[PDB]
C-alpha cells in the first residue's frame, strides 16, 4: 500500500513543530483562527460534552474554513513528539494533543497541499 492513509496532515504538523509554527491548545488555536496566522485547523473527534469541537467548528466558519477530521488526537501528538528523549525509540508517555492549528507551514507542495485542495473544492 503506497497511498497515504491521511498521512499528509501528520507530516505537516511535524514540520510545523520543527519550525515552531504550531498553535496547540484551544485558546491559541482560536487566536490563530482570528488573525493572519491560523492556516490549517485540527480538531479532536472524541470530545466530552462536544463543546470544544463545536467551538473549533465555529472558528473555522467565522471567515475561512481550514478544518479536518483528526484521528483521536493522541496519535497526532505522538507523531509530533510530546515527550523528551523517550529512551532510544518510541516509548513516549501518551498525551492527548487536544485542538491544534497550523501557522507558517514551512515546507512547500507535496501531498498535504493536494489533500487540502480536496477538502476545499466541493
Amino acid at each position: 500500500a503506497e497511498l497515504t492513509i491521511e498521512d499528509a496532515l501528520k507530516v505537516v504538523l511535524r514540520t510545523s513543530l520543527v519550525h515552531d509554527g504550531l498553535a496547540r491548545g484551544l485558546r491559541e488555536s482560536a487566536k490563530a483562527l482570528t488573525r493572519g496566522e491560523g492556516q490549517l485547523a485540527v480538531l479532536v473527534e472524541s470530545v466530552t460534552e462536544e463543546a470544544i469541537s463545536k467551538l473549533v467548528q465555529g472558528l473555522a466558519t467565522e471567515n475561512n474554513v481550514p478544518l479536518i477530521k483528526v484521528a483521536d488526537a493522541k496519535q497526532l501528538g505522538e507523531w509530533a513528539g510530546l515527550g523528551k528523549i523517550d529512551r532510544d525509540g518510541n516509548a513516549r508517555k501518551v498525551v492527548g494533543a487536544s485542538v491544534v492549528v497550523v501557522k507558517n507551514w514551512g515546507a512547500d507542495t507535496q501531498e498535504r497541499e493536494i489533500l487540502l485542495e480536496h477538502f476545499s473544492q466541493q
Binding site: 484551544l26 487566536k31 482570528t34 488573525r35 463543546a51 467551538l55 465555529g58
Partner: protein, 69 residues
C-alpha cells in the same frame, strides 16, 4: 554571629488560581460564534478585555486600557 529576629508573618508567591475552558465566549446556533465581553482595540483580535466595575485592561500589553465598554 547575632541571632535572627523572628517577627513571624511569611508571604509566599501566589499559585495563581489557574482556570481553563473559561466561561467567556459562547455559541447559540452552531455554525457561527458569539463573542462575550470584547477583543482588544490596540492589539489584534484573539485577546479579550478584562471586565470590572467601569475599569478595563489586557495582559499582552501588560495592562493598558481606560475607556469603558
Amino acid at each position: 554571629k547575632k541571632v535572627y529576629t523572628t517577627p513571624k508573618k511569611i508571604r509566599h508567591k501566589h499559585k495563581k488560581v489557574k482556570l481553563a475552558v473559561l466561561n467567556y465566549y459562547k455559541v447559540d446556533d452552531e455554525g457561527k460564534v458569539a463573542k462575550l465581553r470584547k477583543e482588544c482595540p490596540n492589539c489584534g483580535p484573539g485577546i479579550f478585555l478584562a471586565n470590572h466595575g467601569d475599569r478595563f485592561y489586557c495582559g499582552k500589553c501588560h495592562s493598558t486600557f481606560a475607556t469603558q465598554k
